[PDB]
Design a protein around this ligand. Structure first.
Ligand SMILES: NC(=O)[C@H](CCC(=O)O)NC(=O)[C@H](CCC(=O)O)NC(=O)CCc1ccc(-c2cc(-c3ccccc3)cs2)cc1
Ligand SMILES: [Ca+2]
Ligand SMILES: [Ca+2]
Ligand SMILES: [Ca+2]
Ligand SMILES: [Zn+2]
Ligand SMILES: [Zn+2]
Length: 159
């Protein structure tokens, strides 16, 4: 078992916005991604603009201040740290990707669901049906559902 948040009220802050999308769409993608996970756990997520935000959402490129540099367009899309203080919980998105609300470029919502999974303490799944599976694939956002493996995973951490 990986680290878990020791509380059920979790704050996030969007540190900065990708120029790829309009700010409202980024807000929406991230809010919906958190909702995916709160729907199956006791966790609640609230957005703040400063202070002790647990999960900082960041768009950055290349070497961006942690020991996990990005790689330009393609390859690594994003990464996140497991629960913990400071950088713990933070989710970083490679600005060298083209972030979208849709199937073109890289879908932000789907990517954030995966990354928030990490921010909550989940590792990768070997189940190709699970959002925690290591590789990106676009699926109809309107019919997207957490797999039973994802639900198993997150419910093993929070109840
Ligand atoms: N390897 C790839 O296919 C793509 C893009 C390829 C390219 O442009 O270079 N890159 C990535 O996949 C990199 C891997 C980097 C590496 O280890 O090499 N992954 C990462 O950057 C991790 C981030 C991440 C992982 C998974 C997803 C998605 C899962 C689903 C889904 C929905 C329902 C059921 C099952 C799955 C929809 S989307 C989104 C974001
Ligand atoms: Ca943090
Ligand atoms: Ca990349
Ligand atoms: Ca970009
Ligand atoms: Zn990073
Ligand atoms: Zn991952």
């Amino acid at each position: 078992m990986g680290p878990v948040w020791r509380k059920h009220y979790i704050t996030y802050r969007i540190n900065n916005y990708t120029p790829d999308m309009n700010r409202e769409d980024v807000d929406y993608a991230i809010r919906k991604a958190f909702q995916v996970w709160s729907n199956v756990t006791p966790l609640k997520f609230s957005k703040i603009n400063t202070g002790m935000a647990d999960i900082l959402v960041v768009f950055a490129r290349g070497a961006h201040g942690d020991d996990h540099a990005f790689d330009g367009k393609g390859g690594i899309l994003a990464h996140a740290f497991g629960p913990g203080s400071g950088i713990g919980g933070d989710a970083h998105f490679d600005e060298d990707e083209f972030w979208t609300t849709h199937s073109g470029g890289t879908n932000l919502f789907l990517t954030a669901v995966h990354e928030i999974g990490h921010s909550l303490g989940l590792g990768h799944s070997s189940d190709p049906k699970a959002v925690m599976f290591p590789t990106y694939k676009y699926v109809d956002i309107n019919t997207f559902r957490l797999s039973a493996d994802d639900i198993r995973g997150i419910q093993s951490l929070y109840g």
